[PDB]
Design a binder for this molecule. Structure first.
Ligand code: HEM
Ligand code: HEM
Ligand SMILES: Cc1cc(N)nc(CCc2cncc(N3CCOCC3)c2)c1
Ligand SMILES: Cc1cc(N)nc(CCc2cncc(N3CCOCC3)c2)c1
Ligand SMILES: C[C@H](O)[C@H](O)[C@H]1CNc2nc(N)[nH]c(=O)c2N1
Ligand SMILES: C[C@H](O)[C@H](O)[C@H]1CNc2nc(N)[nH]c(=O)c2N1
Ligand SMILES: [Zn+2]
Lengths: 407, 411
């Protein structure tokens, strides 16, 4: 019931007690572990609201106060009457920050308290949504000095009036299938890129075409909008030692901005809540560039290095992987765009974890996602035992809109 | 109940039904995953169900379930239990059992080799000297002049737990580690405590950086005895790099034979507390963990210095750059000396094929992702993108406490 987590590199042991407040289920059972699986009414709503407001007033050292009691009362009133309720701005801000704080797969949570929250609950149209997203992007990019932010659109009602951003990130490159069987651009977006064209997008059929936004307001049909290019800060990729690198023609964007998740606060569901921070180097260089199902350029970089690609045991893949990540980190720092290497980030997360164990009594963490895709065991998170469980408020996954949307 | 696992690189989906035959716990609950946690006297009462369950498996595998041969064996075992509180495995059962323990080892990326395991029955062993001889023969056979062969040696099973056989070493071959007055460490930091135990037990320590530890062997619950493995039986590989001539000057070498000796083999309710098993190394085990862990030989610094990497900011990825060269060197050295070894790309690719095969013919393959995924270059191996189910089948290898923490000293 009270749990121990050991670091095996430093022998340090923390005691987790926060997990006893775990509400949601994990997929796992006493018989089977699923830690590596990617995705496993009025009555319902009242307790959910109470649990939240309780922890809120607790955080502000005003638990059991009349302000607490009165709010619990008032929210209770509003639910019995309207079958839902609205969050005060302070609650909303607390809720968003805490959903990040509870994101077990996020290595960047040491920054959790410095989240800019833009309240877009007054939004009513796709054009209104577009305005808010543009402003989000601009605030967050900040000429390269990136800042964490979330923009929150109206909460779900009867499920027929959902607000959705159909893109998975605010900023991604298009994917096109070629007649010659291969793929141009980003293969991960071939379907979304189809839907865009299917909805009227004029694709320049290039390799790094910033996708248009597809915005759905109030359960309506989704509309297309192009982000002003001047707001999409991109970084050309060069190597600090290999001149030929530039010739590969690689660039990537500076703003990672997740837009398809569902924010749940106090039993309320915010289906459109795009949020952004800044990249860890490996996300781009390792995943985006070198994954087979992506830009998959390892072979090309390897050939320009003239490494022996005759036998896997020359580790040419690994050698190429390193230069590529060296270059990505190099380009961003050169262009003065915020980015963090996997060493510094994981070290930050260790400090954060210790902080959370000390001031909160634990920190839900998912080892499978915290450990970077390269160099895993030379980072301190590798040797860190972690406990995974789900606390609310939270970001949850949600189905792709196109499967759901009644047209 | 069916369970689906997906590969996100290939979209190959698999169905698990094998998890239904799982009985042991995992550590996880509906409200917590402990999947990244490293660690999660038996009566006639629970013993016979365990016996029966095993013998049913065994006779299914040889296509003789429900046979008279099957039934007589059950009644044989039953009577042996109620009259002697334990029972003895036939040799055929012991072999079947050890192979399956490996096959069920959810943390082992090397399980594709599981059917080819030489099993040495050391159950007639009664003394430490007898243990030394068995272990020496295991090492000689397994090493096979560098053309390594998988093997396991099985010593007598636990009885009342007051007469255990144990190998006190964690691996049959390992380098000493000595803590110095100034706080630093000579040798392998992982083995400091064991080295001390040995030294206390009368081992004369050469005190170098690559001293092969002696065997500390407990037979029948008696106090353990020291034995030195004959050096001619200890295959070692000088580490050098194919491009970097200064690399040999680092003075590194490693032993060829990975051989785990502190685990507990459970078959049909029987506990075999001494069961050293060995295979061959995956490159990263040496080049990533043994050399580059902070709490091990920690040569990342020096290698990076000699490559003259930019070590002022970690953003140069000097740590990663050096890590790769060390692993290239480990592979290059073993291959050049014709000592069997596998790189992490070949190993994980093979495990993936094995796994898919296990799903088809067997209905599943329990796998611990946290352990299967290699400790460098993780996402450019196919296992990174593979959803895996973890659960516990028997027979199995279990951890067991260190013997110096439980042993009752005789004198
Ligand atoms: C500020 C710097 C940030 C860094 C360095 C960072 C880093 C990461 C990384 C590396 C992942 C792993 C996902 C993958 O590799 O595919 C991740 C996931 C995640 N991050 Fe953070 N992030 C940052 C900001 C944020 C912010 C501002 C939020 C929310 C307010 C957030 C919420 C999440 C969530 C919910 C996930 C899990 C998403 C999923 O399940 O796919 N992150 N983050
Ligand atoms: C023959 C080639 C083999 C290879 C390449 C191999 C590879 C590995 C690796 C890399 C690990 C994880 C090690 C680590 O944490 O550093 C492992 C774990 C394991 N292997 Fe294998 N192995 C092989 C043979 C065997 C054999 C013959 C057995 C038993 C008969 C076996 C049983 C196990 C067990 C029980 C574990 C879990 C160890 C632990 O929890 O500490 N392996 N294997
Ligand atoms: C804010 C942020 C910063 C950062 N450095 N990295 C990410 C991760 C982006 C990201 C990571 N993993 C899965 C998704 N998807 C969108 C959510 O649904 C699954 C796919 C997105 C997000
Ligand atoms: C047989 C075999 C082959 C191979 N290539 N690699 C290993 C490594 C097994 C291994 C890895 N890590 C810790 C332990 N220990 C044994 C259990 O107790 C802790 C030490 C064992 C074993
Ligand atoms: C905390 C975590 O479980 C621990 O560091 C594990 C992670 N994965 C591992 N994987 C392997 N192969 N070997 C290990 O020792 C570990 N250690
Ligand atoms: C199958 C496996 O769970 C899948 O590849 C996971 C593994 N770990 C990950 N870790 C991060 N950071 N991001 C990911 O997308 C994944 N994918
Ligand atoms: Zn689990």
């Amino acid at each position: 019931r009270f749990l121990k987590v050991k670091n095996w590199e430093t022998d340090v042991v923390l005691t987790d007690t926060l997990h006893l407040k775990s509400t949601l289920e994990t997929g796992c059972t006493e018989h089977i572990c699923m830690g590596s699986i990617m995705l496993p009414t009025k009555d319902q709503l009242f307790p959910l609201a109470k649990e939240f407001l309780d922890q809120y007033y607790s955080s502000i050292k005003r638990f059991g106060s009349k302000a607490h009691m009165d709010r619990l009362e008032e929210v209770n009133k509003e639910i019995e009457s309207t079958s839902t309720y609205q969050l005060k701005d302070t609650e909303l801000i607390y809720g968003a920050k805490h959903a990040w704080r509870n994101a077990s797969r996020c290595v960047g949570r040491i920054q959790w308290s410095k989240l800019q929250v833009f309240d877009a609950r007054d939004c009513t149209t796709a054009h209104g949504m577009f305005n808010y997203i543009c402003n989000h992007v601009k605030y967050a990019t900040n000429k390269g000095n990136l800042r964490s932010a979330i923009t929150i659109f109206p909460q779900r009602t009867d499920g027929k009036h959902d607000f959705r951003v159909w893109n998975s990130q605010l900023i991604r490159y298009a994917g096109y299938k070629q007649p010659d069987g291969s793929t141009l651009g980003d293969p991960a977006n071939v379907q979304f890129t189809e839907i865009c064209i299917q909805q009227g997008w004029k694709a320049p059929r290039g390799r790094f075409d910033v996708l248009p936004l597809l915005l759905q307001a109030n359960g309506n049909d989704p509309e297309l909008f192009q982000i002003p290019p001047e707001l999409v800060l991109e970084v050309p990729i060069r190597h600090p030692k290999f001149d030929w690198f530039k010739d590969l023609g690689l660039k990537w964007y500076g703003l990672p901005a997740v837009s398809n998740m569902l924010l749940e606060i106090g039993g309320l569901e915010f289906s459109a809540c795009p949020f952004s921070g800044w990249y860890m180097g490996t996300e781009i260089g390792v995943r985006d560039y070198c994954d087979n199902s992506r830009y998959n350029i390892l072979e090309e970089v390897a050939k320009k290095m003239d490494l022996d690609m005759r036998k896997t045991s020359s580790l040419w893949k690994d050698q190429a992987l390193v230069e590529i990540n060296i270059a990505v980190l190099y380009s961003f720092q050169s262009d003065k765009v915020t980015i963090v290497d996997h060493h510094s980030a994981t070290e930050s997360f260790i400090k954060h974890m210790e902080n959370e164990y000390r001031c909160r009594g634990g920190c839900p963490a998912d080892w499978v996602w915290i450990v970077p895709p390269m160099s895993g065991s030379i980072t301190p998170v590798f040797h860190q035992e972690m406990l995974n469980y789900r606390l609310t408020p939270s970001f949850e996954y949600q189905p792709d809109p196109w499967n759901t949307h009644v047209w």
